[PDB]
Amino acid sequence: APEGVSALSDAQYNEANKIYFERCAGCHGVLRKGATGKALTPDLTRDLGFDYLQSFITYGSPAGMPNWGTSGELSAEQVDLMANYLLLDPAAPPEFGMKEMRESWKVHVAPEDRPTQQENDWDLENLFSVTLRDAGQIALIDGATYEIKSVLDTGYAVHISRLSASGRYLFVIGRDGKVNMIDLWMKEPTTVAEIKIGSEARSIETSKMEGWEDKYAIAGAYWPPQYVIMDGETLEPKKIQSTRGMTYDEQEYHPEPRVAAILASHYRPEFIVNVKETGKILLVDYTDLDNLKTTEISAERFLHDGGLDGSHRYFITAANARNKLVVIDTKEGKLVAIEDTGGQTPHPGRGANFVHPTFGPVWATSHMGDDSVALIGTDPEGHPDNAWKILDSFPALGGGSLFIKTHPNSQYLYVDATLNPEAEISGSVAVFDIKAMTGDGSDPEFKTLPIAEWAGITEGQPRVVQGEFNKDGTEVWFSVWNGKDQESALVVVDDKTLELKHVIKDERLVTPTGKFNVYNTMTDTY
Amino acid sequence: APGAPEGVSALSDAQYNEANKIYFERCAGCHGVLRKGATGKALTPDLTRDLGFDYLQSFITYGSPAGMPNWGTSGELSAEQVDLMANYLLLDPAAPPEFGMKEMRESWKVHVAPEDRPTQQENDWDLENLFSVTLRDAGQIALIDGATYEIKSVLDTGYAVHISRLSASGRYLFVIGRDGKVNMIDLWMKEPTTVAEIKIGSEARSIETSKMEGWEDKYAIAGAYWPPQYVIMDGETLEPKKIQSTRGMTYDEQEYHPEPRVAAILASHYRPEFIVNVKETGKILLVDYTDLDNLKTTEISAERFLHDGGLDGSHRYFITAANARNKLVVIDTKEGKLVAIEDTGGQTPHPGRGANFVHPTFGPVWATSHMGDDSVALIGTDPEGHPDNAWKILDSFPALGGGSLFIKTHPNSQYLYVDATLNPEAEISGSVAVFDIKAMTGDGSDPEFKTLPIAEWAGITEGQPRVVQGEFNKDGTEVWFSVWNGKDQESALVVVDDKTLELKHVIKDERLVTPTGKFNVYNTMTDTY
Ligand code: DHE
Ligand code: DHE
């Protein structure tokens, strides 16, 4: 006989459930099928059994599962409660409306009591806000001295950082929908406001229309299917919008359309919201939240990430499972093109904009499913025949690429290969010389930088990910992402010589992943 | 379970599926998606177990004169389907299904392609003076000559027929039923008939046509109670072009609402937009139909319980009742925003499209009567020339009694007609109140009214005749009222001479079964009210 799975009173079950959706669902999923954390459905957990679940929740694991019991985040009774709850069938995922957001909303420092000018000595625009994935923190690193200025707690499941248009406020979002607002002008920068906007979420963005600096922030959730516009100084939740709706092509109701990347228009006072499963791109005008104007653009399903072109007018985003790039004109508020990249699973991040020597302005992306790099023409006025067409496709290090990067002041295009199965490749970066490109059909050659080897890290599984440039566009940073119980680092590459500039190492630099330069993020320079 | 005490004569899964399809397709328009009843009674298990199999089988077989079709004896459901349904109704209520593009397209039929239709009117009818009258329990509409008063044609649309609307040019007649059935009729044919049809949901009430200058006959839109959605359709073929879900957040508490019904739908005359009331979330949508792929909409926070409403006399401002909250919500359709929300001081305002007129002392006003009390309320509708009266309730006075549904006037007339359809007294419910607009002063003295004995003029005694909804002819000189009696009883339409307030003519015919809504082509196509 299989061990006995205990009762649980209504109160206990209600208590367990609140904990699950508030603190576990960001990594284990609202239906318990897993996300960064393993699936915890009862077909799996009953086999593991109570003792095993209790031990894991008490001690955590170095692969990213918090030590709930030993950290005192959960009491001994709460730990047993959760182990017992995981042996039961998955509960119905709850909604998360205004009442729930406002209960979680905290303003630690009201706007009137914050500084009126920068009170620290830091070079805010050249700071790098780095995600410490399994530590639940971000590191604020000086872009010139390479010193860790501070390490701030945001919360387990920390995902990425974004900056307000003025560069004063640092916004961080976690996979649980937790949002932290950090005031960079304080003597000792810390969280001045926080709020939770759902159970699962990935994106956040700030108002970037000139004249709307610091007015609003917007966050998108995976569950429930909604986005929220918040006050840009206090995080007060002002407008919640459901994304449930019809698919663009079959026009069938879809009960769970996740919000993916959220960007901000520089032509109009609008947020640009990708709705994944229905294939809709939303242009949301924040001029008036009560008489709310939006444009719901039929695009392509599987929208994920993307970026604005060099002129900041057009939004280019990957509909990744269908291998397409979708192009929106933010000035006219309309779809302008849909093109296949020729590769498998394009994953641009915000992508890489540059001026090709013969094609004109282009935007590039690499792929998760193959080694190709694709370029799309982005200049309807000056290069009409090249506009929104794939002009070239060439191989980089290998499949498993996540991020491509460049900067106006650099002649090089950097491509990672983070998820490649071969350590030599996943620990390296491909670099192309833009000035040597000809678009004559021949594959441009690349130099291979041994980033992980340069950091002196071989133990564990160090994966190199995401180039990020400093404010001047002279140095590019890469994360050497190793396990929490392993040695990690950040490698700074001298852009002009393509030589190692510096290796950042520190006991607090745990699982570093996303890196965001204040100036480059606030101005959308990529 | 079937052999257990509490147990019911099961249907295999497949039999259940067939019954469930019949239920949602043919019964839910009147009995409700959760079987809680609408026009038809609740059919939930609590009640149906006490009727028992044989009662249900006979009720579904024979029907009744209250509006329930005789599915069995008409041949509409074969012998076995009746039993299936009777068995089905004893079971727990199924989860209401979605109704997307695939299901709409399966129901979409184009009987006469546009290429094959007339290029000019091929009958000799006076189309703009025609009246389209809903024959409720007959599942038909009657097309009636507005001057000779003869029934030109009786057309089958479907059980649960609700109301009629006209395309902007007056050529196409659109009718919607409570089951979401949409019929398009071409009034230019020698013998006008349905040229296209489609189904847009399981439960629905509204339909409307594009009225922006330049977009005449381009689009039609239908709104549903279930599923919670509206659909924009091609104005000539009924092809479903865009389906939009109305599921979303309430305007005030900002909490998700899984089933926000679509109530009235009107059309802007200032922008190429449809005006959609979303009842439970309290949102009014301004939907721009110039580009359905890059869809522009304005989601206006208003007040919950939005139901019916109309445009002011200038056609710029939408005025709609949030009925359970006793409020009028006013939207500026030129600027696309909320401009006011006001309490009428009455209970449950039910304006229909309302009544616009020029009050001698207040200026332009729009009026509504109420279901819950005898009051008539007036709101100022001219912010430009009468800014101190604009969007203010300027007067409130009594008409015949509570239970009023429709109030009506016309630019060519000085009278304001008010019905009292649901009043418990037959004496009141068979009459209509009429106020002289020219004698109104606005000093706080209730305007007096003349009582027209509309049911008595009809010369009907049997059943329980109720008078509903004034509708004028094209020239604004005669106003029609429906004398709604039961299906197996005699009904009529009464035509009143506006200038003398005397009986003009009584329309009676064997085919005139339960006449309710009446829509004059010209006054509907132009929004004259
Ligand atoms: C929707 C989304 C965005 C765009 C945010 C915005 O527009 O504000 C994004 C951006 C990002 C960006 C933005 C980079 C930029 O330059 O804009 C980075 C670095 C990033 C690093 C990672 N992402 Fe993130 N990421 C997801 C979703 C997203 N990632 C996932 O659904 C996914 C695949 C799985 C998951 O469970 O979360 C996932 C896993 C990862 C990682 O494993 C990465 C590599 C490392 C990590 O920190 O967990 N994601
Ligand atoms: C949403 C809605 C509209 C506006 C449509 C538009 O904007 O195109 C409307 C209009 C109407 C109009 C339009 C009048 C006008 O001048 O615009 C009429 C005459 C009408 C006669 C009736 N309505 Fe209708 N009506 C409902 C809903 C609606 N009715 C109901 O939810 C309700 C209360 C119950 C029901 O189950 O359907 C209902 C019962 C009735 C009746 O019992 C009426 C009186 C008679 C009948 O035919 O069933 N409704």
Ligand code: HEC
């Ligand atoms: C992300 C920051 C996490 C949060 C928040 C929670 N969990 Fe987790 N959990 C996470 C990971 C990455 C893993 C896999 C660890 C590994 O060593 O591979 C886990 C694992 C578990 C387990 C063990 C499951 C198994 O071994 O099959 C359990 C029982 C579990 N997690 C429970 C749990 C609960 C109850 C949480 C809320 C208190 C919770 N986790 C949060 C990542 C994350």
Ligand code: HEC
């Ligand atoms: C609107 C046109 C209807 C449609 C379509 C269907 N029904 Fe109906 N039904 C309707 C009314 C107005 C009434 C009340 C009749 C009365 O005399 O008061 C009914 C009643 C029933 C009943 C009897 C309930 C009772 O007596 O308490 C049953 C079992 C019933 N209806 C079933 C039914 C089915 C199975 C239908 C689909 C084929 C159906 N109805 C359609 C109005 C309308």
